[PDB]
Amino acid sequence: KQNLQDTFLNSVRKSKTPLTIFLVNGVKLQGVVSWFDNFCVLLRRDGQSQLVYKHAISTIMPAQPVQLYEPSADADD
């Protein structure tokens, strides 16, 4: 159904998992994903939410393991 990005982003948003965003320029932002579309992610931190462009993000690391139902390495996609 959903791809890898939508599954990952919807999962960490529905579970409100604390995250760490590693921007390509080395800046690190923390918070939770409250909303995302095709080009950006809305990061909520305390009461302040900031828009982060996907094109500026390198990695998104959850603070705790998150259930993504990743495909098994025994069969194809």
Binding site for its own copies (CB under 8 A): 3-5, 8-10, 13-16, 22-27, 29, 34-44, 47-62, 65-66, 68, 70-71, 73-74, 76-77
Nearest distance in Å: CB 55, its own copies: 6
Identify whether the C-beta of residue 50 lies closer than 8 Å to the C-beta of residue 19.
no
Nearest distance in Å: CB 32, its own copies: 9
Q: What are phi and psi of 55, to 5 degrees?
A: -65, -10
> Residue 50 pairs with which residues in a beta bridge?
43
Nearest distance in Å: CB 18, its own copies: 13
Q: Which helix (H) or strand (E) holds 6?
A: helix 4-14
DSSP state of 76: -
Q: Which is nearer to its own copies, 18 or 42 (CB)?
A: 42
